[PDB]
Structure formats: C-alpha cells, structure tokens
Amino acid sequence: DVVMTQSPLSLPVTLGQPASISCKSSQSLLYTDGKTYLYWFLQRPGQSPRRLIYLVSKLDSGVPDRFSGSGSGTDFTLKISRVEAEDVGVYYCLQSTHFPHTFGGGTKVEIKRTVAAPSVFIFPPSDEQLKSGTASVVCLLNNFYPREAKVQWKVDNALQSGNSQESVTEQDSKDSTYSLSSTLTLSKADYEKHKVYACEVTHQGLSSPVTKSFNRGEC
Amino acid sequence: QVQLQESGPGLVKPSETLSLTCTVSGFSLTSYIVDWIRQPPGKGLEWIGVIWAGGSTGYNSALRSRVSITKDTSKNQFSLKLSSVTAADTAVYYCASAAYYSYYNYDGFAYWGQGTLVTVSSASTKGPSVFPLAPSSKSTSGGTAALGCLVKDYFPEPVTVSWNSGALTSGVHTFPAVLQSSGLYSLSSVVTVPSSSLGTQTYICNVNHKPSNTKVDKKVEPKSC
16 A cells, blocks of 8 residues: 655644645555646544645645645645644645555644733532532633643642543634643542642743632632 | 535444445536545544445455445435444544546545544443533633533543534633543533623533433523622
C-alpha cells in the first residue's frame, strides 16, 4: 500500500503569517490518464472532514484563495498564504491513484495568539445528584491561551489526588482560545464531612495561582 | 448542494455484524460513487471501500473480506456491513460521494456524511443522568454568569447537548467526555450569559443520547448567594 507521510504533526502559526504542510508518498501519484489524484481536507472537532483541494491544486467551491496546493510525483504541499483564526483544525492529505486509497496522518494547525488568562468558575453538586449518594464538583477555566493550565482540587485545604478528571476543548475558530472543565467526584458522605471546596488554577496569564472556592451549605 | 444522511450511532456486540446506511441526495445530471471511510477515536482516517454507479464494488483488503457495500431498494440508499467485529472496529464511519462523469473521468470524496460512531461492546446501553451546574456569585464574572449541565453515567458515546432547543448558541462550550473507572462517560456543557438575564430568562439544557433513546431537558436554576 502507498504510505502518505505528513509533516509536521503540529503546526503552531501566528495570525496573518504563512503556513506550509508537506505530504510525501511512497510511490508516484501520477496516474496513467495524466492526472494526480491527491486531495486535501480540513477536519474540525466533532465534525466530518471537508474537502479543500482535489487534483493537487484545484480548489473546491467556497475555498478562499489564501489556500493553495502544489507538487508532483511523490512531493506535495498545502500552503496558506496568511493564516486566519478559522483555519485551525486537522489537515489531511489523501491519494486515490492507487488501490487501496490511503490518507496521511494529519497536521494540526494552531493559532499562536496573545496570552489570555482564564476566567475561573466553580459549581457545587446539585441536590438531585446528592439524593443518589454521589457529589460532583465542577471547575471551569474559560477562554484561555496558551493551552497549558494546571488545575488542583483542595478540600478543606487538603490537595486532592485520583478523584478528578478533566477535558479541554479544541482551539476556538473565532478567538483562538481553549476552555477546560474539571470534575471532582466524592461520595455524598465525604462531601457532607467537608466545608471548603476549591479549585486552584496556574496559567501563564496569571501572576500568581487563582483559587475559586465555595463553602458547602452557604445557600 | 449534495447531502449525505447516515443512520444513528450505537452498539455492536463483538463477533456480530455492524450495519449502517447512507442516503445521498442532490445528484441529478450525473451518476455518482459512494466511498466509505472510518476514523477510530483520536486517530486518522482509513478507507474501507467504494460502490460504483452500476453496483459493482471495491474493498480495502485490510478488512479481510468482512465488508459488504450494497444498494438498497430506496432511491439513493446504501448499506455498509462489517462482519465479525472486534474493538479494532470501534470508529466514526463516514460515507462520501462525488460525481461520476464516465469510467475514465470521476471525482471522489467531494461530499461527506456527518459520521456515525459505532462502538463494539458486549455491555448494555445506559442513558445519562443530567444535573444542573447552577450559576451563583462563584460563577459570575462582572456582568456575565456561567451555568451548565453535567451529563453523567452514560454508555456508549455520543450525546448531543443544545441550549434552549438550539436558540442559544453563543458562549456555549460542550466538552469532550471522560471515561470513568465504572466504564461510563461523563460530559459537561457550559454557557456564559448576562447575569441580569438570570431572573427573566429560563435556561434549559437539551440532552439526547441516541443509543439508549434517552432525551432529557433540564432547567438550570440559579443559586441565591
């Protein structure tokens, strides 16, 4: 099978600056009809890949001219002359000259924007969940940049370990930020035995760690 | 101006047969071809096979003759079947179509379906519990308040979350789900709104878990402090 190698795996780029993605095939993609069946797609989070380019350099309908494709034989390139906030996502190349058709491993384009401190929010468990014997506490870090953020859970100032999980959204296509949600899960008994619930946030946009807390049973 | 609609997500037991359908609308002046592609969670894309205009097929040999693509009775409807499944077959499956001008001139992969997640598991489906993430002064930043819903203890993925039946979209963040040690998923969906709107506007999260036929609407009421 034809191996499709994409380079780089991750592409951080400053807004308005050019980006170049390489796609290399283990065999020539030139078919017997004189055409080169090389395509480029963009895939956004939780969405299907969308075609940008076909036949090496042909742009699909609605694709702006900042996008271009070039190459021949085994070496191909996708270029973005001036990267925009909406260009973030995973780019994939594909060959269909040979059977089976094969895709490149993908290149994630990221916007390098100015540092943005996260807005930190905390949510107590609901009475509905408390009735079931479990208590989930949620900490939200909203619209921050860069992606690196440290969340620490504290229950009556005691650092928590092995009872929390978190996930991060993909980079926003409009403001180029990330958001993070972290859930602390305790039994109702442990929850009712403690008073202060805090989430401690460390990020580049913060001069010192920010602690967002609530006292159980304030209202 | 072409639309591809795929059948719903759900479970397939290991060793059993995965079955999906795709309906291709919008081709009128030419015939078309339908390619099938899959994407394991957090991985790349793998081509499965193709069904040509006349009904003949081409399959990826990596699928070891476990695959079948057929034309259904209903106009523009196609079925993909994959036999003897294992955890390696858990993926988002897509159908993709393109114009076929002649055997010597055809496009490929021009228009894609939304993708359907098929999970290979011997476990039963489980609908989620939906809990409010109540706004309070602990979630209220200078004129703006954050609120949400915690969609907990469901299986398999995915779940869809909307706010106010889709009328509320600005400031919404729906997070990737996490897999707990119980083997059940937990997801949160949050929204930032003007805090002055909290006493005059009702906020409801609409949760749909297609694999278990579960639909939950939860009103998110503010705390007093």
